[PDB]
Design an enzyme around this catalytic site. Structure first.
Site, PDB file in Angstrom:
ATOM      1  N   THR A  89      72.924 -34.656  16.189  1.00  0.00           N
ATOM      2  CA  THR A  89      72.632 -34.286  17.647  1.00  0.00           C
ATOM      3  C   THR A  89      73.441 -35.224  18.519  1.00  0.00           C
ATOM      4  OG1 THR A  89      70.308 -33.532  17.188  1.00  0.00           O
ATOM      5  CG2 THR A  89      70.741 -34.256  19.417  1.00  0.00           C
ATOM      6  N   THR A  90      73.183 -36.580  18.415  1.00  0.00           N
ATOM      7  CA  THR A  90      73.999 -37.610  19.058  1.00  0.00           C
ATOM      8  C   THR A  90      74.797 -38.362  17.983  1.00  0.00           C
ATOM      9  OG1 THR A  90      72.120 -39.226  19.284  1.00  0.00           O
ATOM     10  CG2 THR A  90      72.712 -37.933  21.245  1.00  0.00           C
TER      11      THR A  90
ATOM     12  N   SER B   9      69.626 -39.193  16.597  1.00  0.00           N
ATOM     13  CA  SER B   9      69.262 -37.952  15.939  1.00  0.00           C
ATOM     14  C   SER B   9      68.685 -36.984  17.002  1.00  0.00           C
ATOM     15  CB  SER B   9      68.333 -38.243  14.745  1.00  0.00           C
ATOM     16  OG  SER B   9      68.105 -37.117  13.908  1.00  0.00           O
TER      17      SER B   9
ATOM     18  N   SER C 199      78.845 -33.501  16.225  1.00  0.00           N
ATOM     19  CA  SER C 199      77.550 -33.784  16.909  1.00  0.00           C
ATOM     20  C   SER C 199      77.990 -34.802  17.904  1.00  0.00           C
ATOM     21  CB  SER C 199      76.430 -34.381  16.048  1.00  0.00           C
ATOM     22  OG  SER C 199      75.981 -33.485  15.074  1.00  0.00           O
TER      23      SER C 199
END
Lengths: 211, 246, 234, 205, 245, 219, 249, 202
Positions: free
Chosen positions: H1-2, H48, H170
């Site tokens: 995600t990150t 995350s 991501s």
């Protein structure tokens, strides 16, 4: 209002340095912007707008023009619908009285303010205007004219006996009535004065003049 | 008589009385003088400074531990004036209130807001007959996030209002009078000047002049939002500065 | 809390037909600084004088005129401590009503809701009956509203009423000058006259505050404007 | 104002506009499941006696929650001598449905009403528990929302009188009942003046 | 004070004309009537000492507990009436117990002293419950402040002390602590010295015998709070008797 | 579904939105307010499910009302960001709401995106809904991180209309909500098209082929 | 709390009626007269509005008469703070019963429910009763038309014509003679109502602001609750003065 | 995600942070800044999934927010790390991403703690977690040599973040850097388009 910070400040300087003539144009403009009183963003501008108009006179002394500009001020006073109205008119009136541009002109302007003040509004606004108007009438030596206007103050206002402006109107009347050489009247006017004077809401100055 | 007369049960618990306030409430004001502390509050334009007497009644104290300056948040600092029993207790209550904002808001609470939540708190004590009102008052300093340095004080009965200058103490009326003349004559406010006004006024009325370990100065500067203790060396610095004014 | 607590009422009736503590409370509202509230019928103006008497108050915030929400405002009379809870309370109520209606709390409705909580405070123990009188202003639904809430709980809807120092004189002037359905200019002018009736709280601009409710919401007025209205009265 | 299911033997609201009157037309339908036995029972209700709010689906909680809402509308109507605003009541209903949390039972509110003492036209539908719905256009609502929506666009007479809207509407209701099981079961048409309510009950199964 | 027949000294949600409740003051006499608890702050730990009076010759150590182990690094030494001491002990234990378990480090004392004093004080305010007529100290060894000792009075006032005594001869005990340097001295030497002050306080013509409870939280135990080991305990008492004479 | 966007310019929000709320391409609502005025300095854009989005914003709005009134100083953006994240996650959420949170704090303008889970995050321009990508392609290039405000009103009207016309998530009309920092500016016509129905000749039922049935007074 | 501040606020007396309740009756007396009279086709309430002064915005319909429900109304005589708590709850219970049941609320039902809350305060809690006696006017489909009174204790009695306020004792005595239990049409009933306000109020010229008469009549198959207009009240007063001059010489 | 990596130094600490948050396919958030604060000296980064992590951070931040005021001095790092863990053991079915706790305590001024989705709190010389960091999860340990110095560490945290971004989808490519010292937190944003990204397979 849209510019009583920009345009009004410049007008004030032009009135002191040079003549009112240039200023006549500016005076119309500022009063017209001021007409909208505002009640939600009126703010600092409105407090200044009304103050400067009152302060305008006797920065060049007596002129024909001094009398003339004032007529524009008469629509503003009425339109705003605030308490601060009382203050402006009274001021503007007293200064023209001091610096006569003609007795005829000064009497017209006070007469019109008064007629408007009698219609609705408040007893407080009407009284400041009338002291100016009887005094103009006393000095000119039209004692009879003062008597008429003066009588309106006696009949209606009595109800209130706590009114500070009202002592000033009536002592100028008693004096005029003395000159007129109708002695019952001279006492009558005094009676109205003293009743309202007894009240503790009236300064030492006002209490003094009664006597 | 008066200040000890039954008319309900108002010289015992909070209910109004013949005096047009509340007797129980008035003992809570009277209570401030007993503690023996007097404070002067000045609001600068680079900091907000509170100086209060620090009550030292032993010679077996460590300096750091014994104070009345408390960190409520990393934006607000305070001094407690009045009875010390009541002081510790109000500070712990405030702390929960500061923390409660702290999670929700995601930022440092305004000095005005901190004072509003505590002031209301001091009112519950005052409204209630279940407990007596606080014998102390908390006087806040802090950098408000746009208005500037701000000084607010909440009463022992809990009402708060903003101040240029405040005083509470043994002599509440006299310190305030000394303080208005210092404001009137306007030396202006830098870090040093405003601190200097504040200490002198506390010294002149009571007529003492202090050691740096018997006054406490606490600031919130715009150097950083965090509240600091200046400690004795810097407090001494301010004391010497007072001479040959204004 | 961590105690047993109280629950017994501190008020017992009288064979007079009175409740004793509310009468002591009524004396405290009179001991306040003059607060007047008039519904003109072209807006609502609440004006007060605040005894600071040193102008060492850097208030650009809290005052005796404090907005509850954006078209409700509140002015009190008496003592400050009792005000502090009522002002916070009102803001909370404003929030409760904001969620469902999303037009902030109406004045007729506000009073009933405050009145019920005030009555408990008398009726129950471990709390006591106020000795503050609130004047509530609002402009909502294209009508101005003025109510007065007494320290008992009672609510009356007024056209013009007075409280604070020398209220008896104030209410009597108010009848003579003000008559029903006069202009916004009259409402403001008499409002400032009642404060002037007896002042004595340091005559500087920051010692009177007015807040006005009108068609566009509620804002409190700058102290400099307030002074101009005063200046007229001698 | 959450009602159990939608099965009320009929669900339909149409509101259509004029400048001289505004109209809300409704099934007067009652009785859950396919079997009805009745064709009468209140569903559109006057709340200021000149504005309406329509709550739509099964009878019990439709009548129950309306009435409990009526009491809060009333409080506000009571105290002041002028009655509540339509826009403020519009968010009030939105919230009332929202109070019944995530995975709620579906109602479909229709509010039709001219605004009180600020005079402009108002029609709105709510459904689910949703974002604010102020419109000034037209609104049709129910589970057969598309079918109602068609009709709500269909009646607007911008210049004819009140009467022509009624006769147009009678045909509009009928054609809709042949298209869905939501219209019909008797039809009540409400032409709302601002000062009172006119109720007309239409002929149509 | 006053001895008014309705309230003020018969309630404690009522303040006197001056602003004080007489009820906390009557409670303040109670610490003075029984034996002392001394506690001095070191910088390697804290050493506590309470003399437990042998009232009955058929008691054993752990009877009339004046020494509590608040956590495993926090102590509490009390003086005054033991029933109010117990309550104060219970609250302290729970407050300390949640902080080690959850945070994972030693408790900074200054906050803890303020919280417990808040508890004392909250009860004073109330007329429905009583002021606590005990004076007590809290002591801890921390990795954020080192040793800290705070003393909280029956009024709910908290001050930090380099070295305190609360009990039936505060003036004699405090003064002996002043003369000595124990402020930053090593915990081991301190054990002997704290006991020796207890010896001066105690009289053989006002007391028969006492049983020494000292508590370590210091370098012997490696910062663990235990009631004094029997060998050490004896050594320190042995010195106390021998050195006077 | 829905269409919501913000742009970052001199004042806090220039908001663009369709009025219509549609489930896929069928209208549930012809006009609504998807970018909301609840306060006049806190504005919030909406996307995704209507129900989830409304409650998340409203809860922040209530907490903002308290700060605003006490301080007499502006609403706090951070407070709003944190509040929707904790409060809607606790509830576990009925579906997803992409919400655009926005207020000017004490410092510069802050715009935030609450994703489809429930989070407090910091960007500076947000677009929300299934049309987040669609609304973004115009916004990201014409805006080059601060531009003329007035130019932004022309540009944004142009972008907003493009979302409406090319993407079937938006019936009726397009609404723009402009705040400098306490302004409330609404013009619901950021697209040129006829608002409702048109009847130049009036027949919607043949001339009295049906007649008026009954009139009653329900008192 | 404290037991020296307790002599028992709530207790039973051996005379059977609480001290605080008798003390509350004197307070009821003080507030102005509120009466209810029955008609054989309506029921009405007539009360004198608390306000009498020039200054009054007139945001409430009448401070005394509260329109609770579309078949019930009540007036209060006594403490106005105390009135606000009972009238708001009353508003909610009366309304729920007409609305849901489709059966107009009985006064007898209403009072028993409210009186339970009033009573709780007198027996236990250390509290005190409400300062008001409330007169309910309504119609129910059971008994028919009704009038009920409730008192501080939570004691009720059902009349059909009763007056409370100052000169109560005198009033009820006048009322016994002219009205028994049903003989007056809606217009005579209303004339009777103005008559009772007349003797008891000091001002015998009255005014539409000074008194308020609200009527409840079932007309055209729905039960109508209306506050009468200033014109309508004024017409009833003008009709009543002519008749006053003739009646008593 | 990150994309998050935080490396512990023998000097003090260095952080490295994303520029994009990505949903299922579309990028939710196009400009990333993560500093949820529990204290003004200690910070955490939400790695995350944003949501799962943020709610843990938020409950932990309320207790630590309370705590820092209370103690008088700010909290220690180890206090914050036990609290992050305390939530995460319970809500391990609802959060399973990664929390990255890094800063200064008062007991040494040199602590980096990792609270994982499978739970454990341990101190490690380097850690990378989140979306693109998992790719390089064994690797970030591999790239340094234990106890490296402040200057060298700074080039490595930048270089490994680029190599992770390249590796997963991501992250973006902008390295947002944060140098943590006694001072406070100071953050620098080093541009990308101009410097060289790690080699890519034919």
């Amino acid at each position: 209002m849209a510019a009583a910070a920009v345009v009004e400040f410049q007008r004030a300087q032009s009135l002191l340095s040079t003549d009112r003539e240039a200023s006549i144009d500016i005076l119309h403009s500022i009063v017209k912007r001021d007409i909208q009183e505002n009640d939600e963003e009126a703010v600092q501008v409105k407090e200044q707008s009304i103050l400067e108009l009152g302060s305008l006179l006797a920065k060049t002394g007596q002129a024909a023009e001094l009398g003339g500009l004032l007529k524009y001020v008469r629509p503003f006073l009425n339109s705003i619908s605030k308490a601060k109205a009382a203050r402006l008119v009274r001021s503007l009136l007293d200064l023209f009285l001091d610096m006569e541009a003609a007795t005829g002109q000064e009497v017209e302007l006070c007469l019109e303010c008064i007629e408007w003040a009698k219609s609705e509004k408040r007893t407080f606004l009407r009284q400041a205007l009338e002291a100016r108007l009887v005094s103009l009438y006393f000095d000119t030596k039209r004692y009879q004219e003062a008597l008429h206007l003066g009588s309106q103050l006696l009949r209606e206002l009595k109800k209130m006996d706590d009114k500070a402006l009202l002592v000033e109107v009536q002592l100028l009347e008693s004096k005029t009535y003395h000159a007129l050489s109708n002695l019952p009247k001279a006492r009558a006017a005094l009676t109205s004065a003293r009743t309202t004077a007894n009240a503790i809401y009236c300064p030492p100055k006002l209490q003094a003049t009664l006597d | 008589m008066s200040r000890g007369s039954s008319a309900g049960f108002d010289r015992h618990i909070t209910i109004f009385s013949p005096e047009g306030r509340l007797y129980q409430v008035e003992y809570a004001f009277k209570a401030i003088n007993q503690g023996g502390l007097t404070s002067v509050a000045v609001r600068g334009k680079d900091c907000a400074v509170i100086v209060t007497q620090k009550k030292v009644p032993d010679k077996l104290l460590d300096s750091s531990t014994v104070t009345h300056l408390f960190k409520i948040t990393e934006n607000i600092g305070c001094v407690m004036t009045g009875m010390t029993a009541d002081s510790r207790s109000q500070v712990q209550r405030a702390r929960y209130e500061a923390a409660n904002w702290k999670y929700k808001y995601g930022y440092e609470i305004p000095v005005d807001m901190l004072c509003k939540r505590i002031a209301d708190i001091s009112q519950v004590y005052t409204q209630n007959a279940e407990m007596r009102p606080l014998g102390c008052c908390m006087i806040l300093i802090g950098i408000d996030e746009e208005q500037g340095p701000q000084v607010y004080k909440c009463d022992p009965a809990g009402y708060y209002c903003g101040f240029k200058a405040t005083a509470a103490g043994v002599k509440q009326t006299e310190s305030t009078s000394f303080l208005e003349k210092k404001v009137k004559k306007k030396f202006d406010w830098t870090f040093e000047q405003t601190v200097e006004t504040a200490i002198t006024c506390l010294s002149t009325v009571l007529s003492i002049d202090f050691k740096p370990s018997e006054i406490e100065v606490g600031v919130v500067t715009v150097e950083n939002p965090k509240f600091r203790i200046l400690t004795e060396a810097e407090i001494d610095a301010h004391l010497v500065a007072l001479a040959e004014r204004d | 809390m961590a105690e047993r607590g109280y629950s017994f009422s501190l008020t017992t009736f009288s064979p007079s037909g009175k409740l004793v503590q509310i009468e002591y409370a009524l004396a405290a509202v009179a001991g306040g600084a003059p607060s007047v509230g008039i519904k003109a019928a072209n807006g609502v103006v609440l004006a007060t004088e605040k005894k600071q008497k040193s102008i060492l108050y850097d208030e650009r915030s809290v005052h005796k005129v404090e907005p509850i929400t954006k078209h409700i405002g509140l002015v009190y009379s008496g003592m400050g401590p009792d005000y502090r809870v009522l002002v916070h309370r009102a803001r909370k109520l404003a929030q409760q009503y904001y969620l469902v209606y999303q037009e902030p709390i109406p004045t007729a409705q506000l009073v009933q809701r405050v009145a019920s909580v005030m009555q408990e405070y008398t009726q129950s123990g471990g709390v006591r009956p106020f000795g503050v009188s609130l004047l509530i202003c609002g402009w909502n639904e294209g009508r101005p509203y003025l109510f007065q809430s007494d320290p008992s709980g009672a609510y009356f809807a007024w056209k013009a009423t007075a409280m604070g120092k020398n209220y008896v004189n104030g209410k009597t002037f108010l009848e003579k000058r003000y008559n029903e359905d006069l202009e916004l200019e009259d409402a403001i002018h008499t409002a400032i006259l009642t404060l002037k009736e007896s002042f004595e709280g340091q005559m500087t601009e920051d010692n009177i505050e007015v807040g006005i409710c009108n068609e566009a919401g509620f804002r409190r007025l700058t102290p400099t404007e307030v002074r101009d209205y005063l200046a007229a009265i001698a | 104002m959450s009602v159990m299911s939608y099965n009320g033997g009929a669900v339909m609201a149409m509101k259509g506009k004029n400048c001289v009157a505004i109209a809300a037309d409704r099934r007067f339908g009652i009785q859950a499941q396919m079997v009805t036995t009745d064709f009468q029972k209140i569903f559109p209700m006057g709340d200021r006696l000149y504005i309406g709010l329509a709550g739509l689906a099964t009878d019990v909680q439709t009548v129950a929650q309306r009435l409990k809402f009526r009491l809060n509308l009333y409080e506000l109507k009571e105290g002041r001598q002028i009655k509540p605003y339509t826009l403020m009541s519009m968010v009030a209903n939105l919230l009332y449905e929202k109070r019944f949390g995530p995975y709620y039972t579906e109602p479909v509110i229709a509010g039709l009403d001219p605004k009180t003492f600020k005079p402009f036209i108002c029609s709105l539908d709510l459904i689910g528990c949703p974002m604010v719905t102020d419109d000034f256009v037209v609104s049709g609502t129910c589970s057969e929302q598309m079918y109602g929506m068609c009709e709500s666009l269909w009646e607007p007479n911008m210049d004819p009188e009140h009467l022509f809207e009624t006769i147009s509407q009678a045909m509009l209701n009928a054609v809709d009942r042949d298209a869905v099981s939501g219209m019909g079961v008797i039809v009540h048409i409400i032409e709302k003046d601002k000062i009172t309510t006119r109720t007309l009950k239409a002929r149509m199964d | 004070m006053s001895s008014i027949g309705t309230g003020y000294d018969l309630s404690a949600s009522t303040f006197s004309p001056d602003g004080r409740v007489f009820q906390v003051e009557y409670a303040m006499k109670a610490v003075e009537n029984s034996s002392t608890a001394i506690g001095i702050r070191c910088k390697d730990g804290v050493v506590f000492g309470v003399e437990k009076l042998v009232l009955s010759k058929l008691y054993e150590e752990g009877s009339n507990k004046r020494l509590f182990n608040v956590d495993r690094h926090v102590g509490m030494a009390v003086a005054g009436l033991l029933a109010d001491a117990r309550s104060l002990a219970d609250i302290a234990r729970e407050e300390a117990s949640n902080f080690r378990s959850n945070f994972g480090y030693n408790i900074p004392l200054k906050h803890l002293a303020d919280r417990v004093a808040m508890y004392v004080h909250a009860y004073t305010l109330y007329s429905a419950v009583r002021p606590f007529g005990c004076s007590f100290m809290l002591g801890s060894y921390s990795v954020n402040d080192g040793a800290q000792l705070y003393m909280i009075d029956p009024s709910g006032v908290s001050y930090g002390y380099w070295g305190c005594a609360i009990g039936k001869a505060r003036q004699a005990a405090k003064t002996e602590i002043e003369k000595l340097q124990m402020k930053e001295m090593t915990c081991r030497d301190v054990v002997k010295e704290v006991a020796k002050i207890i010896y001066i306080v105690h009289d053989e013509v006002k007391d028969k015998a006492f049983e020494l409870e000292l508590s370590w939280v210091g370098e012997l135990t490696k910062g663990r709070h235990e009631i004094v080991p029997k060998d050490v305990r004896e050594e320190a008492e042995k010195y106390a008797k021998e050195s006077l004479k | 579904t829905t269409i919501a966007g913000v742009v970052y310019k001199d004042g806090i929000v220039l908001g663009a939105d369709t009025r219509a709320t549609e489930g896929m391409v069928v209208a549930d609502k012809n006009c609504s307010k998807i970018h909301f005025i609840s306060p006049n300095i806190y504005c919030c854009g909406a996307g995704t499910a209507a129900d989830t989005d409304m409650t998340t914003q409203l809860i922040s709005s209530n907490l903002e009302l308290h700060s605003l009134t006490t301080g007499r100083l502006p609403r706090v953006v951070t407070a709003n960001r944190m509040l929707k994240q904790m409060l809607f996650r606790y509830q576990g959420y009925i579906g997803a709401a992409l919400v655009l949170g926005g207020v000017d704090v004490t410092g510069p303008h802050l715009y935030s995106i609450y994703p489809h889970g429930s989070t407090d995050k910091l960007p500076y321009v947000t677009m929300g809904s299934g049309s987040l990508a669609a609304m973004a392609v115009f916004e990201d290039k014409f805006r080059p991180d601060m531009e003329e405000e007035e130019a932004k009103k022309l540009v944004s009207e142009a972008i907003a209309a493009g979302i409406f016309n090319d993407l079937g998530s938006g019936s009726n009309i397009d609404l723009c909500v402009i705040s400098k920092s306490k302004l409330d500016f609404l013009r619901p016509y950021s697209v040129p098209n006829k608002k409702g129905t048109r009847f130049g000749r009036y027949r919607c039922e043949k001339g009295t082929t049906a007649v008026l049935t009954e009139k009653v007074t329900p008192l | 709390m404290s037991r020296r501040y307790d002599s028992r606020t709530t207790i039973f007396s051996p005379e059977g009626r609480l001290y605080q309740v008798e003390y509350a009756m004197e307070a009821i007396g003080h507030a102005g007269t509120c009466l209810g009279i029955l008609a054989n086709d309506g029921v009405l309430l007539a009360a004198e509005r608390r306000n009498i002064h020039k200054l009054l915005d007139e945001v409430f319909f009448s401070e005394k008469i509260y329109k609770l429900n579309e078949d019930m109304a009540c007036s209060v005589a006594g403490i106005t703070s105390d009135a606000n708590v009972l009238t708001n709850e009353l508003r909610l219970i009366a309304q729920r019963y007409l609305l849901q049941y489709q059966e107009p609320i009985p006064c007898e039902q209403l009072v028993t429910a409210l009186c339970d809350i009033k009573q709780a305060y007198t027996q236990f809690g250390g509290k005190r009763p409400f300062g008001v006696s409330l007169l309910y006017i309504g119609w129910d489909k059971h008994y028919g038309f009704q009038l009920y009174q409730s008192d501080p204790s939570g004691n009720y009695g059902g009349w059909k014509a009763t007056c409370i306020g100052n000169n109560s004792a005198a009033a009820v005595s006048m009322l016994k003679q002219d009205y028994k239990e049903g003989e007056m049409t809606l217009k005579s009933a209303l004339a009777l109502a103005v008559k009772v306000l007349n003797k008891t109020m000091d001002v015998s010229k009255l005014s539409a602001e000074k008194v308020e008469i609200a009527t409840l009549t079932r007309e055209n198959g729905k039960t109508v609750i209306r506050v009468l207009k200033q014109k309508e009240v004024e017409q009833l007063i003008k009709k009543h003065e002519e008749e006053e001059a003739k009646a008593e010489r | 995600t990150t994309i998050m990596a935080v490396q512990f130094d023998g000097g003090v600490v260095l952080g490295a942070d994303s520029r994009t948050t990505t949903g299922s396919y579309i990028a939710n958030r196009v400009t990333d800044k993560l500093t949820p604060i529990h204290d003004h000296i200690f910070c955490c980064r939400s790695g995350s999934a944003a949501d799962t992590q943020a709610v843990a951070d938020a409950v932990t931040y309320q207790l630590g927010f309370h705590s820092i005021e209370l103690n008088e001095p700010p909290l220690v790092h180890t206090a914050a790390s036990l609290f992050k863990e305390m939530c995460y053991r319970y809500r391990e079915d609802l959060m399973a991403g990664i929390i990255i706790a890094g800063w200064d305590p008062q007991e040494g001024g040199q602590v980096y703690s990792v609270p994982m989705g499978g739970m454990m709190v341990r101190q490690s010389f380097a850690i990378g977690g989140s979306g693109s960091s998992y790719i390089y999860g064994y690797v970030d340990a591999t790239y340094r040599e234990g106890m490296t110095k402040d200057e060298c560490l700074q080039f490595t945290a930048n270089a490994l973040a680029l190599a992770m971004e390249r590796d997963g989808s991501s992250g973006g490519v902008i390295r947002l850097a944060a140098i943590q010292q006694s001072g406070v937190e100071r953050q620098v944003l080093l541009g990308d388009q101009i410097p060289k990204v790690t080699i890519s397979t034919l």
